[PDB]
Amino acid sequence: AAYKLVLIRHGESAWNLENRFSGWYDADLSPAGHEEAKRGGQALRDAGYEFDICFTSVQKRAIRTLWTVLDAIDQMWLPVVRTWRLNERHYGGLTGLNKAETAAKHGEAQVKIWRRSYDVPPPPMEPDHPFYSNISKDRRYADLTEDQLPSCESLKDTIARALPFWNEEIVPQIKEGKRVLIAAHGNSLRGIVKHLEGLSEEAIMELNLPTGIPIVYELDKNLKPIKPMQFLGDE
Amino acid sequence: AAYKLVLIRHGESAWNLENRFSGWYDADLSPAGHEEAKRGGQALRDAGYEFDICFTSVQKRAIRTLWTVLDAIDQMWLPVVRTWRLNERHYGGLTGLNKAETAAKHGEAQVKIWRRSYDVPPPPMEPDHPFYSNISKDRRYADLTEDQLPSCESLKDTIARALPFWNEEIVPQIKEGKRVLIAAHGNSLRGIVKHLEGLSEEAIMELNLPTGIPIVYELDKNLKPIKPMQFLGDEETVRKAM
Numbered sequence: 001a002a003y004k005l006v007l008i009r010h011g012e013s014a015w016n017l018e019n020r021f022s023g024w025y026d027a028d029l030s031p032a033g034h035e036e037a038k039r040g041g042q043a044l045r046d047a048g049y050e051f052d053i054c055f056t057s058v059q060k061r062a063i064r065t066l067w068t069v070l071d072a073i074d075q076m077w078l079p080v081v082r083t084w085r086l087n088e089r090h091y092g093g094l095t096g097l098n099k100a101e102t103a104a105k106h107g108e109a110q111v112k113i114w115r116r117s118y119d120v121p122p123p124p125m126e127p128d129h130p131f132y133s134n135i136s137k138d139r140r141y142a143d144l145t146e147d148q149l150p151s152c153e154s155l156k157d158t159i160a161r162a163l164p165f166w167n168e169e170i171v172p173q174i175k176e177g178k179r180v181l182i183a184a185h186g187n188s189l190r191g192i193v194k195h196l197e198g199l200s201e202e203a204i205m206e207l208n209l210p211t212g213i214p215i216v217y218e219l220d221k222n223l224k225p226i227k228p229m230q231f232l233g234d235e
Numbered sequence: 236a237a238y239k240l241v242l243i244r245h246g247e248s249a250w251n252l253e254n255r256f257s258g259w260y261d262a263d264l265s266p267a268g269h270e271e272a273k274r275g276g277q278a279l280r281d282a283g284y285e286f287d288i289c290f291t292s293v294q295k296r297a298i299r300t301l302w303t304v305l306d307a308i309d310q311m312w313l314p315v316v317r318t319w320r321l322n323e324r325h326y327g328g329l330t331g332l333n334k335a336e337t338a339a340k341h342g343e344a345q346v347k348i349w350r351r352s353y354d355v356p357p358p359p360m361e362p363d364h365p366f367y368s369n370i371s372k373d374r375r376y377a378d379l380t381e382d383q384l385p386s387c388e389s390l391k392d393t394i395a396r397a398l399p400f401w402n403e404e405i406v407p408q409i410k411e412g413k414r415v416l417i418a419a420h421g422n423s424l425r426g427i428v429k430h431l432e433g434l435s436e437e438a439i440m441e442l443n444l445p446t447g448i449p450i451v452y453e454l455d456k457n458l459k460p461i462k463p464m465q466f467l468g469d470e471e472t473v474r475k476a477m
């Protein structure tokens with residue numbers, strides 16, 4: 001095909017193990033997630049993948065997964081661009097909560113909406129929340145305007161802020177023939193998947209992308225996939 | 236105190252104990268150089284340093300030093316800019332050789348001239364050299380013009396291609412009040428120290444920049460240092476640097 005694009009969701013995080021909604025909280029990789037990232041990088045190495053530029057979020061689970069992949073493929077010299085627009089969805093006031101206890105307190109129907117719905121946001125992260133200053137006052141977001149800084153996001157919201165970056169910064173690299181690697185998060189990667197494949201809201205709601213596994217797209221000149229996404233790794 | 240600038244030479248590389256000229260060969264950190272970078276990162280975390288943008292070379296020994304520092308200070312999210320203009324000197328045909336070997340091949344006379352001189356380059360790395368294709372045809376230098384791509388560099392040549400990047404790319408960030416960290420190499424950092432401190436050619440060649448130790452400058456509004464460089468670390472590290 002004209003273009004090759006590779007996506008990778010971060011390896012397993014420390015809050016993935018604690019069973020807590022992370023969102024914008026900056027959880028690090030677990031030791032297993034570090035091994036998953038090292039596996040995905042080895043798979044790309046074995047397949048002889050070359051990139052020209054990498055994009056990632058401002059969240060260390062994604063950045064570290066990128067790093068681990070670039071060390072595995074011996075391409076640590078590549079230019080890397082970070083943007084909050086590739087962040088995980090902002091889980092709002094759910095951030096830090098245990099997911100089982102949240103289902104216990106709110107019931108299955110409400111937590112299913114928050115987790116799996118396309119356009120219902122979680123409750124806002126207000127100033128009394130224990131991660132308010134940790135996240136909303138983090139200086140990595142100093143340059144967002146008041147309207148850009150979310151207190152919560154639905155999946156639709158997350159896509160609405162990820163796609164302008166895809167269109168303004170990523171697509172021009174792809175049309176140059178530069179080979180792009182994007183290391184990010186399930187929900188921001190889903191914006192790109194949905195957009196590349198023209199998926200409906202119901203179909204994007206059903207797709208889950210595994211942590212730490214390279215996803216390869218072969219795109220034609222209109223940046224439309226010429227075949228289904230392929231995962232890289234052993235059997 | 237208009238501005239705070241932090242420079243760090245890469246932690247000790249795998250070739251240092253072999254006294255071998257790595258140059259543009261992409262050697263990694265040694266175990267000890269990774270510990271140096273970790274200690275520098277912990278020294279910066281404990282002094283509470285915050286940065287807004289980082290610059291580094293295209294060589295892994297410097298990039299890994301930066302990643303280790305940023306992990307330690309929990310600032311992995313900062314923007315990082317890599318450039319070949321902050322690379323180590325290109326040692327030309329001397330790349331890959333140790334000092335004994337450079338003398339056997341080139342003779343003591345030329346070897347001492349290349350070692351002592353600010354502006355006599357080493358011999359070029361020609362198509363028969365073991366590292367020719369490895370460096371010259373590495374994709375990371377593919378954007379350089381035929382004239383930009385060095386085959387060998389004196390220290391003057393290295394300073395000549397690093398200072399434009401300092402003047403064009405880094406100075407403007409410092410004047411916008413961005414707190415800069417530069418993780419690079421002894422010889423490219425020499426360009427910056429020479430320039431900041433107005434040092435002579437002889438003084439910049441004698442100046443040791445230790446591996447892996449954060450070097451803090453406080454600059455006035457003209458980017459001139461208000462005091463000597465500060466080596467940042469614990470007593471043992473500072474005592475070895477001093």
Ligand SMILES: [Cl-]
Binds near residue numbers: 080315
């Ligand atoms: Cl980076």
